């Protein structure tokens, strides 16, 4: 069996949806067109329901037929473990219902892995489709018992060391361990019968469900990390014209989770929402190209579309498909085929992509999400007083930097390497990360002391990991920030922070923060209040502005001032060595990468007008390698059309 | 035959030749005085109303010892008889005071026995009054909240499932849904109403049996009218402006009432029908879309129903309830027990009937030959696919009824009659469908059996117009668009894609720079036998298939819903007229062009043709009437309408009846 | 000391005590509180922070706070707050079980026996914020109490005439249940302490007044309190009318108190981060506005929640008057100016009596209960929703506030109907949809004896059993000299245009038409009878059955309601009471007396400087208090946006 690595040739692929009633002729037509569309890979849901017989034996014939037709057309298979479940369950169950159900799953894995491991075109086991859910089954006996046991094996006090009341987030910490346990158990079950094939899983809805996911632990039992990134389910925090930024952030979040493992996008939107989806669309040909290039530029080893062909009955019947109802290519399959073709014509370049890290990392943590859920009591009013502000704030910084043509990491705090000796020219952004503990504050102190730049806005560090506010009891970040909060005062959803000397008018959301400096240099507003500071801490710097300016940019639909302020704070080396825009461009993105020593840039225009983007930083002259609407450059000034995707190769 | 007439006895038996009546609920509860009740019947008689409806509350007849005391209702029946008023009597067993509408099914076997006792006592006693006109078996059968929680319903559903044999796969092997709940609910309504009819018939074989289905644009998926015909003498209805017409603005409650009348008329088949429950007065705290009907609306509603073959209009209510829910609400009389402008208006229509008995007793709607068809299964599949979302678009509950109602409105604004029928109420057995038209607008579920009926209809000369997602699914929510399109033969074409767009977009045709409003989804197709119609992007968006002697126009984008969303039915009117057989436009009075917020429907009585015209626009309108034969004589006009040679000048809110000389 | 109507008013604040705090921090709070001219604190006596593993009471945490209070001469309102979940911000409202009741008995014995011995204890707060919108009918203690209550009451399903009725068993039980538990808490305290004032803070009064029988509570309290939070309780108003909200809230509690002194136990002292329904941080200007409104309405105190903040989870670092460095915010600086004014003006400030115009706006429990039945709990913000029966009288209250006229805001049973003469008195019944025969006889007596009755909206449409006498035989026909004909629903906002006086009154939702017998009819420009004036003995009735107070609310314009109401007031009210020469949008005035001297409070909530011409009563304006340099010329006051002014009337 071929094993995926960081040097593998990336593929374009699609789900092949197999259910009873389909003909041999139909299935062959799908694999034939898939191969002709420069796709090398499919994913097949190994439905337990469609292998169980009246007598209780396993009949594999429906899936044998599909695997053999895949093999005939040289198509490799991602096989999803999908035990018997109700027909109406579109995504699959996330945990066993009962001990008896766990034994049924054991039997399912034994039978399916023992049989299908023998196909030479099997590429990977997907341990479970879309682990995690917003509706965790605390009602069910299996989960209820595991939670009770977990609480008894943990030793939590109702008071902290100083004597203050605390919350312990038992449910949230259990759910992390429970996901770790079930996925590790699935991996162990597969490994009883198959030690040869890659193990894979697709975390999903990552801007909501990241607080369920411990990716560093998952690395210990996976060969590759996957993902679902659907425009109609996962990108609700963005308008459609910023699905570029959404896909880039989603790719960066999975890339960070993968660490040293290769990653790929297991499940992308291939087609139309009729009745399905939260934010329904039919992707354009232009969007298909945008999403494949964004993922490959972010080190993806594959993009698999849900779905090649459609389900026929009830939920999503005739929805999501890349082929039309005559089983011929839509403009989406034609577009995807151009990217498969580009890969086959550019194998060495496309097999060795490394993202060009600017040195900017936007960090989120589980605990800011968990504390926010407790403090907002689950309200969904779309503001800072609602679920989602702790992810929308860092995503807004991410957007501002994308609109400056700067790459940024999007990482859980535990995925950041705090162990190095030197952080000169590195930048951490902590945007409205409302919960930080003493351990992470020491890591941030070390980072800044060793030359790091820390940017913090909104309610970053207002609470610890027990929802205890050190702002009230004795501020844990006083040392690092060289300053102390004074007040928060609630204002309107959108207000202006007007700096002394007109240096900036920053859009701000909901709360105005005021501070008192000791060691830091104060920054005053036109009302004579202290609204920000710069602290020199060892060899590094802190910029702290306790009003939500990233959320202010989001609310005002204008990232230009956040871009300008952030650029002014970046170490010179980042702007000298990284291709970026000469200024902020609304609804344009760029991210750069390297392959075998050569530098490349990806540029996408999501504005309504032709844009001329002046690219500066790094070295070399633009050669346009890919441009789907005949972009042209004059010196390093790129003229790019609405919805166009461009790859520049930088020569000498 | 002559055995039915010996059974009939002294009691009136309603027929398609009965003189229509205007009537009102007489609300009887304890605490009212003899003098008050007499005042109501006296004013009802003086208002040219011949008929009342009375709720025979079990609660107000049950005594401490469990005997029935009939005194309260005897008093009312005797005062009705004194003023020559006939009574529709509603069976309404003991129930909580707070239950405004009544329970829809028994709670338990024990409760069923209490209902049996109630029917025995009440029917045995009140059947003896010579002024009893009908038994209403149950008030407003059906509900949006069916009691699956209660033991009687839970057990009936379990038994039903055991007596049906469903597979999880179809003949070709594909997964299926069987809609067990929905099919049970049809059979459950059939069972309980048939049981109530059988219970009444134990004690009274003389009097008409009646029932009032309600909220028909939402609850039609509960109702099997063809089966109900087997135990009713007349079909009724509730059609309340404040409860049932939420899919329409108030200025189109004309169209809402016309469609509601057409839906019940279709359900009635060979039975006579009447409107059992119309809104007679004001909403204070009650209703979803609260109003107080204008005098003009009362006249509009009575004429629309009569023009659609109604044998009566009964207003809820003559007098008001006094305590809690609807206290001092809904009444046609004011708090001094005198006439509101609504009762004065209703009285003019009672007077017209007495002065025009032979005309008004023999109304037959002039069928254009256009039938707008809905089916239970499109509603059931929509409820499964939208997961019950209430966002008011194609991705929500209601689109499968709003789409056909939009075609209905376009035709109303062209002055053309159209039937509104459940697919099983359409007669597919004829040899010739020349000059007949079926509109299937976003009827998302069609099975092989109905497709064969449609093939036969078109082959034999029928015109079929299909828009939106018509035929996307079968009756098991299986999409033949995915597995092998069941309408390919009839349509001479095959779907290619749907692509979701905004709530309102334009279909921009290749030719004439022609534009159609469309809702939510753009459909593209590939033609084999059909003639393709292309858009400016070079995609095929519609086709005409010539199939035997008939034709099919198929446009798989929702253009009826596009007209609804744009609040403009003018293009849908023009397109539909262009597809009609010439004989329909030659033989039927209609407007020379589309008129926004005007309606006309035509009818015949004893060989003479008539037209009803209502102006709901803000301005005086001059409507040029063409088609059929004759010269306009204005027989009814409440605001001094005048005509010059078939051009009618009609005022805002005016109702006009033209007699064609 | 024992509170009385002659006590010197205080400014005070919650001192929030929880484990983890240092001696040094707590001392810093009491020191700054004393330096801020505050004499009083309130402390939540958390059972959770006194219970030991063995079940003994350890009082240490609260001893430390009481001793530091005493050192700085700060008196303590001590809230009885038995052991409860850390997540319970407000406290439980009733015992969960008989066993829980015994735990509460033990808690009261221990806490009252111990803390009664501190010389700086001022009052026991029997329970924090009695009442809740979500009553625990599910729990055994309440389930049993409701069963017993129903067995001891005998309700019929029909009235005397034979009509069906509702009996509102749940609502009547809840009144008796609140009365019982608060009386029981008072009796428990009195087992161990007969020396200290008993106090309680009813809250969210524009929603929860239907839970509260203040006349009964007087029998076991020494003072009535209140919570009046801008972020929880004033949702029926925009922020610019929180002046009117606070004035009405003060008037409602003042009416409930009767002969007892009252004070505001719980005002908003600081910022909402994640908490509150209508979140804000009060301005310095709002702090001053709220203290003066309450004192002008006879309040003996204003206590802010909170001096210092909670540290963990719910409201962590929220609500506090001090900043995160434990120094004064502009809110504490503002409150300190009012504490200073009181110390410099003790005799004036100790003897405030509100100058009653003679106008009383009456609400009743039963209108709220019948509305909840008729609207089925709908929250659509119109007359067909929960709240219209309180928003209607509050709208009249606002119209009068914008005329500079004081008005009482009273439950109907708090009005004294026993007097011989009501000459120059006015009752306004605005959309009080339920009235019974007993209250109608009291209103007949009131009008006969010289009273003026103003009724709008659906006042008297129903009786106390939700039976409409409008349907069966109108109970108010005698008093009104007229009979309803119809209601017809219209749009959310329409205009009632009088034939004669060219009043054009905004009206909400329903148009009422009537027929006059003895009354003089008032016709509109459509030729319909929409109102009447009935002469009844020495008094008069103005009846307009369309909602004109709710019309003013919906149009955001109280000017026409002001003009119409002024035209109906007895001359003596306009001659003897300071008021505005005309309607002023977003300005309020209320007047008071102390030791024979008359004063006026004026607040400008408009965006612009206003010049208000004050007329009525006697004397020349002297500005005694002004936070933005107001000036007067004769009796014409120039007042800045957000400014609070006290005029002393000299002659
Ligand atoms: O909703 C479309 C897709 C997506 O959710 C993924 C996976 O869950 C697949 O089963 C669904 O059909
Ligand atoms: O809501 C008004 C009417 C209507 O529902 C019909 C019937 O149910 C009657 O009982 C109601 O009073
Ligand atoms: O929410 C703010 C306040 C207020 O409700 C009062 C009291 O209940 C206190 O406990 C709260 O902290
Ligand atoms: Cl799968
Ligand atoms: Cl009835
Ligand atoms: Cl407290």
Numbering used by the authors:
A (entry chain DDD): 31 to 682
B (entry chain AAA): 21 to 681
C (entry chain CCC): 32 to 682
Authors' account:
BsGH164 did not react with N-octylazido aziridine 3, but was labelled by both epoxide 1 (76% inhibition) and aziridine 2 (30% inhibition). Soaking BsGH164 crystals with 1 or 2 (1 mM, 3 days, RT, pH 6.5) resulted in the formation of clear covalent adducts. Both complexes have the ligand in the same position, sharing a 4C1/E5 conformation as observed for the complex with 2FMan (ESI Fig. 4†).5 H260 shows a slight displacement in the complex with compound 2. The structure presents no obvious basis for the lack of reactivity with compound 3 as the pocket is quite open around the aziridine nitrogen. In fact, an ethylene glycol monomer is observed bound where the linker could reasonably be accommodated. Our structural work shows that the epoxide and aziridine inhibitors bind BsGH164 in the same conformation found as 2FMan and that the N-alkyl aziridine binds to CmMan5A in the expected OS2-like conformation of the GH5 exo-β-mannosidase GEI.
